[PDB]
Amino acid sequence: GDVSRLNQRNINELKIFVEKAKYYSIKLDAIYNECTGAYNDIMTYSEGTFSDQSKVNQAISIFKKDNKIVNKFKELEKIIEEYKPMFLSKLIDDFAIELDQAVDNDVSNARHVADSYKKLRKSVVLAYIESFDVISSKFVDSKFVEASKKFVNKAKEFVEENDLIALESIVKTIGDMVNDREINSRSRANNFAKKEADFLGAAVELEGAYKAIKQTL
């Protein structure tokens, strides 16, 4: 008759991912807070060696010490491992290699550390969206699948504006939907309000399709 058995399998798969990934944004925030000074010091004091070399060495030490930062990224990778097997792995290797090679003094290497980090930060955000993209694409409900495409696009446009703020919104919003908490569609922001609201509008549309499925189960 109907496809309730299938729709329930889809809700189940989405709910598992979201609950398993619920600390993803907090974990990226902890990387950002530890590394932001070190990133900016590399960008500043490597733009021209004149020199602050001691500052650059110390900045590199924050990214390298006890492989802590690399392992924090691997912890995020392990969260999305089931879903996007090779998304992040190359970019984590690239960073690891730059860190391995940065035995100073070498600004280019120091700038390569900073760029490989920034690129990896943005990938960790896209990885979450890509996982939801793969999950949503297994939905038998065509209205949900259409609403999911619109969400991923607005999600990605939001990432371009600010990767950590975008990831925080995506995680909280998807979280609200699978826990049946009504999504607020308004941004109260002073920075990035336009793109946040575009993203929140696509999430209200998705919440609509999600509820329409849920109400038949």
Numbering used by the authors: 19 to 235
Sentences copied from the publication:
Additionally, to avoid the formation of intermolecular disulfide bonds, resulting in the risk of protein aggregations, we substituted two cysteine residues, C53S and C187S, to generate untagged CspZ-YAC53S and CspZ-YAC187S. We also determined the crystal structure of CspZ-YAC187S at 1.95 Å resolution. Superimposed structures of CspZ-YA, CspZ-YAC187S, and CspZ-YAI183Y, using CCP4MG software, showed no significant differences in surface epitopes. We found a water molecule present in the space between helix I and C187 of CspZ-YA, as well as between helix I and S187 of CspZ-YAC187S. That water molecule does not impact the intramolecular interactions in CspZ-YA, but coordinates the interactions with S187 on the helix H and E214 on the helix I via hydrogen bonding in CspZ-YAC187S(dotted lines in Fig. 6B), likely enhancing the protein stability. Thus, the highly polar nature of serine together with a slightly smaller footprint of oxygen from S187 may be the cause of the water molecule positioning in the fashion to enhance hydrogen bond-mediated intramolecular interactions in CspZ-YAC187S. Thus, the results here identified a less flexible loop region between helices H and I (R5; residues 198–221) in the CspZ-YAC187S and CspZ-YAI183Y, compared to CspZ-YA. In contrast, the Tm-values of CspZ-YA were significantly lower, 57.5 and 58.4 °C for histidine-tagged and untagged CspZ-YA, respectively, indicating a stability enhancement through mutagenesis. However, CspZ-YA but not CspZ-YAI183Y and CspZ-YAC187S previously incubated at 37 °C for 24-h had 1.6-fold lower levels of recognition, compared to those proteins prior to incubation, even though SEC-HPLC did not indicate significant aggregation or degradation (results not shown).
